Structure formats: C-alpha cells, structure tokens
Amino acid sequence: GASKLRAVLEKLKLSRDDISTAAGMVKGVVDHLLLRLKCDSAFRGVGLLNTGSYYEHVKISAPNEFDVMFKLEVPRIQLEEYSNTRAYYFVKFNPLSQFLEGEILSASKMLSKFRKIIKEEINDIKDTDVIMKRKPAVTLLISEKISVDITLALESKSSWPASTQEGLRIQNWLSAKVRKQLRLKPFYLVPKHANGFQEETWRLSFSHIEKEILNNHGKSKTCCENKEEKCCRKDCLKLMKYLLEQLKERFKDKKHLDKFSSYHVKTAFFHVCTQNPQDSQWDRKDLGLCFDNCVTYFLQCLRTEKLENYFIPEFNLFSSNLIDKRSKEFLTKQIEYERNNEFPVFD
Ligand SMILES: C[C@@H](CO)NC(=O)c1cnn2c(O)cc(-c3ccccc3)nc12
Ligand SMILES: [Zn+2]
C-alpha cells in the first residue's frame, strides 16, 4: 500500500518551481556577499560549497527557507579532539592569525568577523531588501519572505580524522573502490560548541559526501537511468524527512520534538541503505515495504537510544545526554500512531 505515499510525493514535486524562483533571489544576495567577503585578507579563499537538501534533490516543504554553505580552505592544520567526543575538535596550526586565541583558532572571533562583514554588506545592497536576524551562524531575510541560514565551514584537504576510520560502511553497497575515492576528498569543520559549553570547538562535516552518495546511490551504475532500474531510495528519504517536518509542525507549541532534526532521519536512512545493499531491495513497486523498514529502523533507534553518526561510529546522535528518554518516547508514540492510521499527518 503505497497510494498515499505516492500521492504525497506528487504534491511535494509541485513545489519544485516555487523553490527554484526563491533560489534565484538567494543566488543574487549570496554572490554579492561572497564578492565583498573575498576583499578581506582572512576570507580571501572563501567559496560556495554546493551541498544540502536542494543540490541532493531532497528539498521538502519550505521555499521561503534556504541553507547556504561557505567553504574556506585552511592550509596545514592540526586537529586536537576535544574531551574524547570523536566529533568535536580544536583547530591548531597565515590569514587567520587575527583569530588565534593562543595556539587555538577561535570559533567566536572567526564568526564575529564573518557576521560583522555580512552585517556591513547587507546595508550597502539596495537592489533587494535584506535584513539580518539576531544571534547556522548568520540568518538573512530577503524581501521579508525568504530566510537564508549561512554557515561557514573550514576546508581541510588532509586525511580524515581517526574517528572516521571505521565509518562510511558503503563497501558492500557502493563498493570499496568508491569508499577509497570518497575518503581522498576534503573534509569540513563547522563551528559548533555542542551547564555551559566549550565555545572554541569545531564539528566535522561530510555534507559533500552525503550529496555524492545520494546522487549516485545504486549498486548498479545505471540505477534510475531506465524503467527496469528505477528505485525508491530518494523517495523513502523525502517521505521520512516530511514525516518529521509534519510532526514537528503539529507539535511546535509543545517543545518535545525540538531536539530532533532531518539529520537524524538522513543518518537512519544511510544505515538502512547499508543494511539493504541490493537495488532489488529498493524496487519502485516495493515503496510501501521500503518506507515501512525506514519507519521501523528509526523507531528501533528511538527505543534502543542508539543512532550512530554514519561517518563517526562512536558518536551517538540519540545518546541520553543529548536527547532525554521522554522526548524519544513522545516521537515513538506519534510515529507509531501515524503508521497505524495510514499516516494522517501526510494529507
Ligand atoms: C542533530 C543536529 C545536532 O547534533 N545536527 C544536525 O542537524 C546536522 C545537520 N547537518 N549535519 C552534519 O553535516 C553533521 C552533523 C554531526 C552531528 C553529530 C556529530 C558529528 C556531525 N550534524 C548535522
Ligand atoms: Zn536508484
């Protein structure tokens, strides 16, 4: 039974043109900010990253909400793992000399200059109306409709940290050949401090690898290139993403589902892909069964309080220290009700 599922997907597809026009306004403002950012010595090598839901063709439900990534190549860096977290690091070693708070690169001083240049540049541009929202680093508001979340990410062309060594288990699905090729690619560090936090740490980012894997997702190279080879991987992720967005909208005034994000859904999705490496396990005709495995796996993670980062196996996104048991039990209660009642939150 995939009828309501196929119905949702068609409706979601109709929002494509609206998302495309809105992206036009954003491309204008962003190209301008990058031209002005490149002027400062520190942000000279700044560029547009091209990762996210939109570039992975999985952008569901919000044309008035865009997330943009700004990469900045950093030359010869040394990482120091913070408090055995496996995901959070200190950036040690130059254009960024001004932001060194000891031998360590300050996330706060770095982001303040970034926010400062952006604040200075949005007043100077009169072509379109752009406002900057108060202290996903910098948030803009274009023409009073479009919100743009701007993230700064350091780029390192070094070997991936030791914590990733046993991650990205795509060998039996996408091949070891591909895994080797992917790990040769750079890695990113976004400033994330996650009583009181360490406001000088950087978290690992592999948004570019997630895009590569999603846009070349089959065991067969010709997956989704012909009628006989069409799969439902992307559709299951779109449906999982929409399921959480809809439930998070339904209970916005409650505050339980606040700690859950589309990243939890996407992570759980990649785990299901590792479990089901065959394209035959993802047949378009089996969408109902495939979406049910995704729902089922996600619920097992919520019950067992275990959702490991796809790249950092030792990092548990569903740890009791991150998300309290009552919140996971609320999300379980809601998802189970939905599955039992042919997904009323969809229509
Ligand atoms: C669930 C929240 C808060 O943990 N995260 C996100 O929403 C989130 C969105 N992209 N992304 C990502 O590219 C990487 C990570 C990540 C999380 C934990 C450990 C290492 C990396 N998270 C994200
Ligand atoms: Zn496919």
Side-chain angles (χ1 to χ4, degrees), residues 97-99 102 104-108 110 112 114 117-118 121-125 129-132 136-142:
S97 295
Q98 40 184 295
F99 318 119
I104 279 151
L105 172 86
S106 176
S108 33
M110 248 262 206
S112 288
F114 184 81
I117 303 164
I118 291 162
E121 206 50 45
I122 61 106
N123 328 290
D124 200 270
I125 43 107
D129 186 66
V130 194
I131 313 101
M132 127 131 37
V138 185
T139 298
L140 311 184
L141 186 69
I142 299 151

Side-chain angles (χ1 to χ4, degrees), residues 162-179:
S163 61
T164 73
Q165 199 258 327
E166 288 303 296
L168 191 61
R169 279 183 50 245
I170 68 172
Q171 306 94 327
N172 297 307
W173 159 43
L174 292 177
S175 84
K177 181 124 78 265
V178 167
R179 199 188 173 265

Side-chain angles (χ1 to χ4, degrees), residues 67 69 85-88 190 192 194 203-208 210 260-267 307 309-312 315-318 322-323:
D67 282 73
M69 267 249 233
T85 56
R86 312 269 122 214
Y88 300 95
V190 308
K192 205 72 166 155
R203 192 178 62 198
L204 290 164
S205 185
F206 305 100
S207 59
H208 61 306
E210 287 160 8
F260 300 99
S261 88
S262 71
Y263 195 69
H264 295 124
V265 143
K266 195 159 115 138
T267 299
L307 180 68
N309 182 282
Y310 198 66
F311 303 85
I312 306 140
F315 195 95
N316 177 10
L317 316 176
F318 277 3
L322 300 175
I323 313 175

Side-chain angles (χ1 to χ4, degrees), residues 217-218 220 222-225 229-234 279 282:
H217 60 254
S220 176
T222 47
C223 190
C224 297
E225 277 196 11
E229 291 194 80
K230 244 88 185 172
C231 87
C232 62
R233 292 180 168 99
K234 280 188 151 179
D279 289 338
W282 296 92

Side-chain angles (χ1 to χ4, degrees), residues 298-310:
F298 194 66
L299 288 162
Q300 190 192 83
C301 296
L302 291 164
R303 297 192 202 92
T304 65
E305 296 183 278
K306 286 178 180 180
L307 180 68
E308 47 178 73
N309 182 282
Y310 198 66

